[PDB]
Short mmCIF file of C-alpha atoms in Angstrom, two decimals:
data_model
loop_
_atom_site.label_atom_id
_atom_site.label_comp_id
_atom_site.label_asym_id
_atom_site.label_seq_id
_atom_site.Cartn_x
_atom_site.Cartn_y
_atom_site.Cartn_z
CA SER A 1420 5.88 -29.77 -24.58
CA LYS A 1421 8.51 -27.72 -26.41
CA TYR A 1422 12.07 -27.05 -25.24
CA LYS A 1423 14.68 -24.56 -26.39
CA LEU A 1424 18.44 -24.80 -26.03
CA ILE A 1425 21.45 -22.71 -27.03
CA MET A 1426 24.67 -24.06 -28.50
CA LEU A 1427 27.51 -22.23 -30.19
CA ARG A 1428 31.10 -22.59 -31.29
CA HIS A 1429 33.67 -20.26 -29.73
CA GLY A 1430 35.23 -17.29 -31.44
CA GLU A 1431 38.47 -16.89 -33.34
CA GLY A 1432 41.95 -17.96 -32.27
CA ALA A 1433 45.40 -17.36 -33.80
CA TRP A 1434 45.19 -20.31 -36.19
CA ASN A 1435 41.91 -19.00 -37.63
CA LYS A 1436 43.58 -16.20 -39.60
CA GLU A 1437 46.46 -18.57 -40.35
CA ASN A 1438 43.88 -21.04 -41.71
CA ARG A 1439 45.25 -24.07 -39.85
CA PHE A 1440 43.32 -27.03 -38.45
CA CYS A 1441 43.40 -26.58 -34.66
CA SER A 1442 41.22 -29.41 -33.34
CA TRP A 1443 42.57 -30.90 -30.09
CA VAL A 1444 45.45 -28.42 -29.79
CA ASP A 1445 44.45 -26.44 -26.68
CA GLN A 1446 44.80 -23.00 -28.30
CA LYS A 1447 43.40 -19.99 -26.44
CA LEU A 1448 40.97 -17.46 -27.90
CA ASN A 1449 42.60 -14.26 -29.11
CA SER A 1450 41.28 -10.74 -28.49
CA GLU A 1451 38.74 -11.05 -31.29
CA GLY A 1452 37.56 -14.46 -30.08
CA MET A 1453 37.01 -13.10 -26.58
CA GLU A 1454 34.99 -10.20 -27.98
CA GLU A 1455 32.88 -12.66 -29.99
CA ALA A 1456 32.03 -14.43 -26.73
CA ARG A 1457 31.04 -11.17 -25.07
CA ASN A 1458 28.83 -10.39 -28.08
CA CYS A 1459 27.04 -13.72 -27.69
CA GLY A 1460 26.54 -12.96 -24.01
CA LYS A 1461 25.01 -9.58 -24.83
CA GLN A 1462 22.58 -11.14 -27.30
CA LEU A 1463 21.53 -13.76 -24.77
CA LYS A 1464 21.11 -11.08 -22.11
CA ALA A 1465 18.85 -9.18 -24.51
CA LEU A 1466 16.66 -12.30 -24.80
CA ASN A 1467 16.72 -12.45 -21.00
CA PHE A 1468 18.21 -15.93 -20.90
CA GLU A 1469 18.56 -17.38 -17.41
CA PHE A 1470 20.73 -20.47 -17.70
CA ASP A 1471 20.55 -23.36 -15.25
CA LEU A 1472 23.53 -25.37 -16.53
CA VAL A 1473 26.43 -24.91 -18.94
CA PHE A 1474 28.22 -27.73 -20.78
CA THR A 1475 31.64 -27.32 -22.44
CA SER A 1476 34.56 -29.38 -23.76
CA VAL A 1477 37.88 -29.64 -21.91
CA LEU A 1478 39.54 -27.40 -24.51
CA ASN A 1479 40.07 -24.09 -22.70
CA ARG A 1480 38.72 -21.98 -25.55
CA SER A 1481 35.22 -23.42 -25.06
CA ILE A 1482 35.50 -22.97 -21.30
CA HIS A 1483 36.69 -19.35 -21.54
CA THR A 1484 33.86 -18.68 -24.00
CA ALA A 1485 31.33 -19.95 -21.43
CA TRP A 1486 32.91 -17.87 -18.66
CA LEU A 1487 32.72 -14.69 -20.77
CA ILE A 1488 29.08 -15.34 -21.65
CA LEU A 1489 28.22 -15.98 -17.99
CA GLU A 1490 29.93 -12.73 -16.98
CA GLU A 1491 27.96 -10.72 -19.54
CA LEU A 1492 24.82 -12.28 -18.04
CA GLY A 1493 25.86 -11.83 -14.43
CA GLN A 1494 25.34 -15.58 -14.06
CA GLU A 1495 28.85 -16.70 -13.07
CA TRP A 1496 27.32 -18.87 -10.33
CA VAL A 1497 25.56 -21.13 -12.85
CA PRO A 1498 26.99 -24.69 -12.78
CA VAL A 1499 29.44 -25.55 -15.54
CA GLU A 1500 30.45 -29.08 -16.58
CA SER A 1501 33.28 -29.86 -19.00
CA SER A 1502 33.88 -33.12 -20.87
CA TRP A 1503 36.22 -34.40 -23.58
CA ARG A 1504 33.09 -35.77 -25.23
CA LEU A 1505 32.29 -32.25 -26.44
CA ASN A 1506 35.85 -31.72 -27.73
CA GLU A 1507 36.21 -30.58 -31.33
CA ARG A 1508 36.58 -33.41 -33.87
CA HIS A 1509 40.09 -34.89 -33.77
CA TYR A 1510 41.81 -34.02 -37.08
CA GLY A 1511 44.67 -36.47 -36.53
CA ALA A 1512 47.76 -35.85 -38.66
CA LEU A 1513 46.00 -32.91 -40.32
CA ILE A 1514 46.31 -30.94 -37.09
CA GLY A 1515 48.39 -27.82 -37.60
CA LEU A 1516 48.29 -28.07 -41.39
CA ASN A 1517 47.07 -25.21 -43.59
CA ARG A 1518 43.65 -25.88 -45.17
CA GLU A 1519 44.40 -24.00 -48.37
CA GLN A 1520 47.73 -25.79 -48.68
CA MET A 1521 45.81 -29.07 -48.43
CA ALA A 1522 43.50 -27.88 -51.20
CA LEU A 1523 46.47 -27.15 -53.46
CA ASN A 1524 48.06 -30.48 -52.58
CA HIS A 1525 45.05 -32.81 -52.62
CA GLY A 1526 42.35 -30.83 -54.40
CA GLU A 1527 39.26 -29.01 -53.17
CA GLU A 1528 37.07 -32.13 -53.40
CA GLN A 1529 39.24 -34.16 -51.05
CA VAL A 1530 39.50 -31.29 -48.57
CA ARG A 1531 35.72 -30.85 -48.57
CA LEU A 1532 35.38 -34.55 -47.72
CA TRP A 1533 37.98 -34.37 -44.95
CA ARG A 1534 36.30 -31.30 -43.44
CA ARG A 1535 32.59 -31.95 -43.87
CA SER A 1536 31.96 -35.60 -44.79
CA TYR A 1537 30.39 -37.91 -42.25
CA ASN A 1538 32.39 -41.09 -42.78
CA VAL A 1539 35.83 -39.98 -43.96
CA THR A 1540 38.49 -40.46 -41.29
CA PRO A 1541 41.55 -38.21 -41.26
CA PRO A 1542 44.97 -39.91 -41.04
CA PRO A 1543 45.76 -40.69 -37.37
CA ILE A 1544 48.15 -38.40 -35.50
CA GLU A 1545 51.57 -39.98 -34.93
CA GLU A 1546 53.88 -39.59 -31.93
CA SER A 1547 56.31 -37.84 -34.27
CA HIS A 1548 53.65 -35.21 -34.99
CA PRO A 1549 54.66 -31.69 -33.76
CA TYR A 1550 51.56 -31.32 -31.59
CA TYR A 1551 51.19 -34.90 -30.31
CA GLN A 1552 52.98 -34.54 -26.97
CA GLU A 1553 51.29 -31.24 -26.08
CA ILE A 1554 47.97 -33.06 -26.47
CA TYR A 1555 48.41 -36.47 -24.87
CA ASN A 1556 50.66 -35.43 -21.98
CA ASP A 1557 48.01 -33.16 -20.48
CA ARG A 1558 46.47 -34.37 -17.21
CA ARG A 1559 42.93 -33.57 -18.38
CA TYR A 1560 43.12 -36.66 -20.60
CA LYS A 1561 44.38 -38.84 -17.76
CA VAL A 1562 41.16 -38.38 -15.81
CA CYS A 1563 38.60 -38.92 -18.58
CA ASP A 1564 35.99 -41.69 -18.47
CA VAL A 1565 38.21 -43.37 -21.06
CA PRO A 1566 41.90 -44.32 -20.58
CA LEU A 1567 44.51 -42.04 -22.15
CA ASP A 1568 45.72 -44.77 -24.51
CA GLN A 1569 42.15 -45.39 -25.68
CA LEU A 1570 41.32 -41.81 -26.70
CA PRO A 1571 41.04 -41.21 -30.47
CA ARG A 1572 44.03 -40.28 -32.63
CA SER A 1573 41.69 -39.03 -35.38
CA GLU A 1574 37.92 -38.96 -35.92
CA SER A 1575 35.39 -39.01 -38.73
CA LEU A 1576 32.28 -36.96 -37.93
CA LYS A 1577 30.61 -40.33 -37.34
CA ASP A 1578 33.27 -41.13 -34.72
CA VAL A 1579 32.54 -37.79 -33.02
CA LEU A 1580 28.81 -38.49 -32.80
CA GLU A 1581 29.50 -41.94 -31.39
CA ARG A 1582 31.45 -40.52 -28.42
CA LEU A 1583 29.30 -37.37 -28.07
CA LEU A 1584 25.81 -38.87 -28.35
CA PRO A 1585 26.11 -40.83 -25.06
CA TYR A 1586 27.10 -37.63 -23.25
CA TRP A 1587 24.11 -35.79 -24.71
CA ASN A 1588 21.63 -38.58 -23.97
CA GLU A 1589 22.94 -39.28 -20.47
CA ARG A 1590 23.93 -35.91 -19.05
CA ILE A 1591 22.43 -33.07 -21.10
CA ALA A 1592 19.13 -34.37 -22.54
CA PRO A 1593 17.73 -35.25 -19.09
CA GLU A 1594 18.14 -31.63 -17.99
CA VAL A 1595 16.35 -30.46 -21.13
CA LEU A 1596 13.45 -32.80 -20.35
CA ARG A 1597 13.37 -31.29 -16.86
CA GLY A 1598 12.69 -27.90 -18.41
CA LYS A 1599 16.15 -26.55 -17.59
CA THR A 1600 17.71 -23.81 -19.74
CA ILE A 1601 20.96 -25.16 -21.14
CA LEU A 1602 23.95 -23.63 -22.93
CA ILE A 1603 26.40 -25.81 -24.82
CA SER A 1604 29.72 -24.07 -25.51
CA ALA A 1605 31.28 -26.32 -28.13
CA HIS A 1606 33.15 -26.41 -31.43
CA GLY A 1607 32.51 -26.41 -35.16
CA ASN A 1608 32.34 -30.12 -35.89
CA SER A 1609 31.23 -31.42 -32.48
CA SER A 1610 28.27 -29.03 -32.86
CA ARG A 1611 27.62 -30.29 -36.40
CA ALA A 1612 27.60 -33.85 -35.06
CA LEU A 1613 24.98 -32.99 -32.43
CA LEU A 1614 22.84 -31.08 -34.94
CA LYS A 1615 23.00 -33.95 -37.45
CA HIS A 1616 21.48 -36.17 -34.77
CA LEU A 1617 18.86 -33.77 -33.39
CA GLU A 1618 17.69 -32.61 -36.82
CA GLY A 1619 17.90 -36.03 -38.44
CA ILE A 1620 20.20 -34.73 -41.18
CA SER A 1621 21.32 -37.42 -43.64
CA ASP A 1622 24.93 -38.49 -44.11
CA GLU A 1623 24.91 -36.71 -47.48
CA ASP A 1624 23.24 -33.48 -46.39
CA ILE A 1625 25.46 -32.91 -43.35
CA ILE A 1626 28.36 -32.19 -45.71
CA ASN A 1627 26.74 -28.89 -46.68
CA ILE A 1628 26.29 -27.67 -43.11
CA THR A 1629 28.91 -25.13 -42.00
CA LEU A 1630 28.65 -23.19 -38.74
CA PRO A 1631 29.98 -19.64 -38.23
CA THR A 1632 32.15 -18.83 -35.21
CA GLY A 1633 30.78 -16.95 -32.20
CA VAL A 1634 27.11 -17.10 -33.18
CA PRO A 1635 24.32 -18.34 -30.88
CA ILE A 1636 22.56 -21.34 -32.40
CA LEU A 1637 18.94 -21.70 -31.32
CA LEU A 1638 17.29 -25.09 -31.43
CA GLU A 1639 13.79 -26.16 -30.41
CA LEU A 1640 13.14 -29.79 -29.51
CA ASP A 1641 9.89 -31.69 -29.01
CA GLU A 1642 8.81 -34.23 -26.37
CA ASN A 1643 10.98 -36.81 -28.11
CA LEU A 1644 13.99 -34.48 -27.99
CA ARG A 1645 13.99 -34.05 -31.76
CA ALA A 1646 14.32 -30.75 -33.62
CA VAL A 1647 10.94 -29.12 -34.22
CA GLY A 1648 12.56 -27.24 -37.09
CA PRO A 1649 16.07 -26.51 -38.44
CA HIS A 1650 18.63 -24.71 -36.29
CA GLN A 1651 18.59 -20.91 -36.43
CA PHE A 1652 21.44 -18.43 -36.18
CA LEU A 1653 20.99 -15.43 -33.90
CA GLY A 1654 22.16 -12.14 -35.40
CA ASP A 1655 22.44 -10.32 -38.72
CA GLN A 1656 21.67 -12.99 -41.33
CA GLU A 1657 23.81 -11.36 -44.03
CA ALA A 1658 26.87 -11.19 -41.78
CA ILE A 1659 26.17 -14.78 -40.72
CA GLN A 1660 26.03 -16.11 -44.28
CA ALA A 1661 29.16 -14.11 -45.07
CA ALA A 1662 30.94 -15.72 -42.11
CA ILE A 1663 29.81 -19.14 -43.29
CA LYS A 1664 31.16 -18.48 -46.80
CA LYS A 1665 34.46 -17.40 -45.23
CA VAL A 1666 34.76 -20.75 -43.45
CA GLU A 1667 33.83 -22.62 -46.64
CA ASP A 1668 36.41 -20.64 -48.63
CA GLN A 1669 39.25 -21.66 -46.31
CA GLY A 1670 39.24 -24.95 -48.17
CA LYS A 1671 39.39 -23.41 -51.64
CA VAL A 1672 42.19 -22.24 -53.91
CA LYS A 1673 42.43 -18.55 -54.82
CA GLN A 1674 40.34 -17.48 -57.81
CA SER B 428 50.56 -34.55 6.76
CA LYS B 429 48.18 -37.03 5.15
CA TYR B 430 46.32 -34.38 3.13
CA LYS B 431 46.95 -30.89 1.75
CA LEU B 432 44.36 -28.19 1.03
CA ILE B 433 44.54 -24.65 -0.35
CA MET B 434 42.12 -21.90 0.61
CA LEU B 435 42.28 -18.16 0.03
CA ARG B 436 40.36 -14.90 -0.08
CA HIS B 437 40.04 -12.97 -3.35
CA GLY B 438 41.77 -9.71 -4.20
CA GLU B 439 40.61 -6.09 -4.15
CA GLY B 440 37.28 -4.67 -5.24
CA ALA B 441 36.18 -1.02 -5.62
CA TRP B 442 35.09 -0.90 -1.96
CA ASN B 443 38.60 -1.78 -0.81
CA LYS B 444 39.89 1.67 -1.69
CA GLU B 445 36.62 3.20 -0.47
CA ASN B 446 37.06 1.14 2.71
CA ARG B 447 33.44 0.01 2.91
CA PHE B 448 31.97 -3.26 4.19
CA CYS B 449 31.04 -5.26 1.08
CA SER B 450 29.82 -8.61 2.41
CA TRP B 451 26.91 -10.00 0.39
CA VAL B 452 26.96 -7.13 -2.13
CA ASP B 453 28.01 -8.88 -5.36
CA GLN B 454 30.83 -6.46 -6.19
CA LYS B 455 33.28 -7.45 -8.91
CA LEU B 456 37.06 -7.55 -8.60
CA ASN B 457 38.82 -4.46 -9.93
CA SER B 458 42.02 -4.47 -12.01
CA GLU B 459 44.23 -4.91 -8.94
CA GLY B 460 42.06 -7.70 -7.55
CA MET B 461 42.26 -9.60 -10.82
CA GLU B 462 46.05 -9.28 -10.77
CA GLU B 463 46.09 -10.59 -7.20
CA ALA B 464 44.29 -13.68 -8.47
CA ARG B 465 46.81 -14.14 -11.28
CA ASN B 466 49.61 -13.92 -8.72
CA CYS B 467 47.99 -16.67 -6.65
CA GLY B 468 47.78 -18.84 -9.74
CA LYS B 469 51.42 -18.22 -10.57
CA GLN B 470 52.47 -19.02 -6.99
CA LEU B 471 50.48 -22.27 -7.03
CA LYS B 472 51.91 -23.23 -10.43
CA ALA B 473 55.41 -22.61 -9.08
CA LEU B 474 54.60 -25.16 -6.37
CA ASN B 475 53.20 -27.75 -8.82
CA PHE B 476 49.64 -27.70 -7.52
CA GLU B 477 47.28 -29.84 -9.57
CA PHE B 478 43.70 -29.35 -8.43
CA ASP B 479 40.97 -31.93 -8.81
CA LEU B 480 38.09 -29.79 -7.58
CA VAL B 481 37.46 -26.14 -6.75
CA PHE B 482 34.86 -24.75 -4.34
CA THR B 483 33.67 -21.14 -4.35
CA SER B 484 30.84 -19.01 -2.97
CA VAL B 485 28.09 -17.62 -5.22
CA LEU B 486 29.55 -14.10 -5.00
CA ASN B 487 31.12 -13.54 -8.41
CA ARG B 488 34.39 -12.16 -7.08
CA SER B 489 35.31 -15.57 -5.61
CA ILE B 490 34.26 -17.34 -8.82
CA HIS B 491 36.31 -15.02 -11.05
CA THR B 492 39.23 -15.48 -8.66
CA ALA B 493 39.00 -19.25 -9.13
CA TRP B 494 38.75 -18.85 -12.92
CA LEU B 495 41.82 -16.59 -13.03
CA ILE B 496 43.76 -19.03 -10.85
CA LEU B 497 42.80 -22.00 -13.04
CA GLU B 498 43.81 -20.09 -16.17
CA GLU B 499 47.29 -19.37 -14.78
CA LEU B 500 47.58 -23.07 -13.95
CA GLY B 501 46.24 -24.14 -17.34
CA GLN B 502 43.59 -26.05 -15.39
CA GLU B 503 40.40 -24.38 -16.66
CA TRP B 504 38.93 -27.88 -17.13
CA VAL B 505 38.97 -28.63 -13.38
CA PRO B 506 35.42 -28.99 -11.95
CA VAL B 507 34.07 -26.03 -10.01
CA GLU B 508 31.23 -26.06 -7.46
CA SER B 509 29.69 -22.97 -5.87
CA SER B 510 27.61 -22.52 -2.72
CA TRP B 511 26.12 -19.67 -0.71
CA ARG B 512 27.51 -21.50 2.32
CA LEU B 513 30.97 -20.20 1.40
CA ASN B 514 29.65 -16.64 1.03
CA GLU B 515 31.37 -13.92 3.07
CA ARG B 516 29.99 -13.15 6.53
CA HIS B 517 26.78 -11.12 6.27
CA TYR B 518 27.41 -7.64 7.73
CA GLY B 519 23.71 -6.82 7.78
CA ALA B 520 23.03 -3.12 8.28
CA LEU B 521 26.76 -2.34 8.32
CA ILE B 522 26.98 -3.16 4.61
CA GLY B 523 28.05 -0.10 2.64
CA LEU B 524 29.38 1.74 5.67
CA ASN B 525 32.89 3.20 5.84
CA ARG B 526 35.13 1.38 8.34
CA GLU B 527 37.40 4.32 9.20
CA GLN B 528 34.46 6.68 9.65
CA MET B 529 32.82 4.16 11.95
CA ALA B 530 36.04 3.90 13.98
CA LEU B 531 36.13 7.69 14.26
CA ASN B 532 32.53 7.85 15.44
CA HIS B 533 32.46 4.82 17.75
CA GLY B 534 36.10 4.10 18.52
CA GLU B 535 38.69 1.80 16.97
CA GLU B 536 38.12 -0.91 19.60
CA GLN B 537 34.39 -0.92 18.89
CA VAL B 538 34.92 -1.47 15.16
CA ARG B 539 37.59 -4.10 15.79
CA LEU B 540 35.04 -5.96 17.92
CA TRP B 541 32.38 -5.83 15.20
CA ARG B 542 34.90 -6.96 12.60
CA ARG B 543 36.65 -9.79 14.43
CA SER B 544 34.40 -10.90 17.28
CA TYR B 545 33.38 -14.55 17.10
CA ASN B 546 30.08 -13.93 18.89
CA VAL B 547 28.78 -10.43 18.08
CA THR B 548 26.02 -10.42 15.45
CA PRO B 549 25.69 -7.25 13.34
CA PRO B 550 22.24 -5.62 13.19
CA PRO B 551 20.10 -7.29 10.48
CA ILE B 552 19.88 -5.61 7.09
CA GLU B 553 16.46 -4.00 6.58
CA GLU B 554 14.47 -3.77 3.35
CA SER B 555 15.03 -0.01 3.60
CA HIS B 556 18.79 -0.56 3.35
CA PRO B 557 20.29 0.81 0.08
CA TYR B 558 21.69 -2.59 -0.90
CA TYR B 559 18.96 -4.92 0.34
CA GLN B 560 17.28 -5.16 -3.07
CA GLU B 561 20.48 -5.69 -5.07
CA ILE B 562 21.12 -8.67 -2.80
CA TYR B 563 17.87 -10.58 -2.28
CA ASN B 564 16.31 -10.06 -5.71
CA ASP B 565 18.99 -12.18 -7.38
CA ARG B 566 18.10 -15.59 -8.82
CA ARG B 567 21.13 -17.26 -7.23
CA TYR B 568 19.38 -17.00 -3.86
CA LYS B 569 16.14 -18.49 -5.20
CA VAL B 570 17.87 -21.78 -5.93
CA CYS B 571 19.81 -22.35 -2.68
CA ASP B 572 19.33 -25.35 -0.38
CA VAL B 573 17.17 -23.14 1.83
CA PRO B 574 14.33 -20.75 0.89
CA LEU B 575 15.15 -17.11 0.12
CA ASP B 576 13.24 -16.03 3.24
CA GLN B 577 15.45 -18.34 5.30
CA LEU B 578 18.77 -16.84 4.22
CA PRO B 579 20.53 -14.76 6.90
CA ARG B 580 20.07 -11.00 7.19
CA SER B 581 23.21 -10.66 9.33
CA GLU B 582 25.73 -13.06 10.89
CA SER B 583 28.28 -13.29 13.69
CA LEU B 584 31.38 -15.29 12.78
CA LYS B 585 29.76 -18.12 14.77
CA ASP B 586 26.64 -17.95 12.58
CA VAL B 587 28.91 -18.21 9.55
CA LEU B 588 30.59 -21.36 10.80
CA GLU B 589 27.20 -22.87 11.60
CA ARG B 590 26.05 -22.58 7.98
CA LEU B 591 29.45 -23.29 6.43
CA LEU B 592 30.28 -26.41 8.45
CA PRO B 593 27.43 -28.45 6.88
CA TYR B 594 28.89 -27.79 3.43
CA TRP B 595 32.42 -28.72 4.55
CA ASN B 596 31.13 -31.93 6.14
CA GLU B 597 28.83 -32.92 3.27
CA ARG B 598 30.69 -31.83 0.12
CA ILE B 599 34.29 -30.78 0.72
CA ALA B 600 35.57 -33.05 3.50
CA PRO B 601 34.62 -36.27 1.65
CA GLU B 602 36.67 -35.23 -1.39
CA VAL B 603 39.72 -34.40 0.73
CA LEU B 604 39.55 -37.83 2.38
CA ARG B 605 39.50 -39.35 -1.11
CA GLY B 606 42.90 -37.79 -1.70
CA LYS B 607 41.70 -35.05 -4.04
CA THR B 608 43.63 -31.78 -4.13
CA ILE B 609 41.11 -29.06 -3.32
CA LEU B 610 41.12 -25.30 -3.80
CA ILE B 611 38.66 -23.21 -1.79
CA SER B 612 38.13 -19.72 -3.19
CA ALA B 613 36.31 -17.89 -0.41
CA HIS B 614 36.33 -14.66 1.60
CA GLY B 615 37.95 -12.90 4.54
CA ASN B 616 35.63 -14.05 7.30
CA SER B 617 34.19 -17.21 5.79
CA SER B 618 37.81 -18.38 5.52
CA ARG B 619 38.49 -17.36 9.13
CA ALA B 620 35.48 -19.47 10.09
CA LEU B 621 36.79 -22.60 8.33
CA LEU B 622 40.28 -22.11 9.75
CA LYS B 623 38.85 -21.89 13.27
CA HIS B 624 37.25 -25.30 12.74
CA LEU B 625 40.18 -27.03 11.04
CA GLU B 626 42.83 -25.68 13.43
CA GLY B 627 40.66 -25.87 16.54
CA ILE B 628 41.19 -22.17 17.24
CA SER B 629 39.48 -20.98 20.42
CA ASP B 630 36.68 -18.40 20.41
CA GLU B 631 39.19 -15.97 21.94
CA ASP B 632 42.13 -16.57 19.62
CA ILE B 633 40.10 -16.38 16.40
CA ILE B 634 39.67 -12.64 17.02
CA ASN B 635 43.38 -12.09 16.31
CA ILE B 636 43.32 -13.80 12.91
CA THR B 637 43.14 -11.41 9.94
CA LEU B 638 43.70 -12.78 6.44
CA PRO B 639 45.57 -10.91 3.67
CA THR B 640 43.86 -10.64 0.27
CA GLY B 641 45.03 -12.74 -2.67
CA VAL B 642 47.44 -15.03 -0.82
CA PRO B 643 47.27 -18.84 -1.01
CA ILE B 644 46.77 -20.45 2.40
CA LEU B 645 48.17 -23.96 2.73
CA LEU B 646 46.61 -26.22 5.33
CA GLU B 647 47.97 -29.69 6.11
CA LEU B 648 45.48 -32.09 7.67
CA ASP B 649 45.72 -35.48 9.37
CA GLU B 650 43.56 -38.59 8.88
CA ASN B 651 40.81 -36.89 10.90
CA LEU B 652 41.04 -33.70 8.83
CA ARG B 653 42.53 -31.79 11.76
CA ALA B 654 45.32 -29.31 11.02
CA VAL B 655 48.78 -30.72 11.77
CA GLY B 656 50.14 -27.22 12.20
CA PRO B 657 49.01 -23.60 11.83
CA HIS B 658 48.00 -22.44 8.36
CA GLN B 659 50.87 -21.46 6.08
CA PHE B 660 50.65 -18.38 3.86
CA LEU B 661 52.47 -19.19 0.62
CA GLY B 662 54.75 -16.31 -0.34
CA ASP B 663 57.13 -13.70 1.05
CA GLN B 664 56.29 -13.44 4.75
CA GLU B 665 57.29 -9.77 5.02
CA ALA B 666 54.92 -8.75 2.22
CA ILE B 667 52.19 -10.99 3.64
CA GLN B 668 52.47 -9.39 7.08
CA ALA B 669 52.23 -5.95 5.48
CA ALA B 670 49.14 -7.13 3.61
CA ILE B 671 47.60 -8.28 6.89
CA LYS B 672 48.43 -4.96 8.57
CA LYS B 673 46.78 -3.24 5.60
CA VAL B 674 43.48 -4.96 6.39
CA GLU B 675 43.79 -4.23 10.12
CA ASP B 676 44.59 -0.57 9.42
CA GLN B 677 41.27 -0.08 7.61
CA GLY B 678 39.68 0.07 11.05
CA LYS B 679 42.07 2.67 12.42
CA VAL B 680 41.57 6.44 12.48
#
């Protein structure tokens, strides 16, 4: 049998235009980001999607994105489950820093590795970090399946997959095998981690995969829950590639 | 008390101003109703409420109310569960009708009986009813714990309690006993039904209970989940009483 699923990363937030790593900072979507969610909902409605379950991270921007999509579909009653295991990759000390500034300071090559490599680990976030308290003092991280003091302080994409894969295998994949229609409202890198696994993308090739914000990602899996083909982006392909280039360019110096 | 619970009915919808029985019609909250939800959230935040689980009906206005409350609390991550068993009382054929016009035609006392009686069952909604289709052709009622054909077509307040109690016993009560702080986002009459059970209100006294829209209701329970005292509306009592009178006045000529 063949199964289809939808995953996407939420829309824009304030730090997007500012070009700052957001990661675990619980920033809300801005007007534009909310509209992006509604657009995704409208596309899914057009395809007559009837979701059975929705999975999100515990970062409110992914949750609000799901809620907006469900409203566009008139499916607000559909069960939603949120887990830190779908949280965006933890950028550690890099959180809050400007990507272009990092390019000027450390070079475009190093920034590309920090952002897209599989094994490179960002420096861990310190208690002195401006956004440390706001993150680790929140109750949502006191009731995770992992103690507060044991949650990551930074993550390589490999680290993300290691804490995300179990959640996929144990709580999402079973529903897919049951023929349920699932929506995963996630983030840029946590989505890349999942795709790397499902599509069998190599450590080297994953570095060139960049996902645009607020765009439905369609994926078809086979009986062995493996991608039948590469992931596809729903929408105008030219605007999608342009959005991807925009994200890539955030890590480059002006030319 | 040993445990604390919060329940409430959502804010205004378009049919509030039109003064029409909404019931199972999946009407959305209007601007004012959304604001009412934000006010509940702010009031609960001011009292340090930290929810562990939220229960709602499958009518979107109660779900959106919960979502707006959680946003104000910065608790969007809190688990939410929805069930038709928390749905508002089914007004059957009376759905869509104007309360004041009905009071004019049949008498204020007659309408008050239909609205607040514990025992009187409204006439069942027929397939010929203008809103029958919009209700029973929705997928949410194809995946309930009972077949679509088994869902009610009208309910007395007693009928409501009979189908709501199983959910309280099976899903909600256990969580409360575990010490979890629960929020129940329900409706006018489904909430009256639960209160009757928790406070041991008699069939006669329940008729006099009218709940204001968008006002948190605090209930303190003992080890046996029995109310230790009457429910407590959280807010300015004068404004809350005016809000209650507002609902009562919808049935007056």
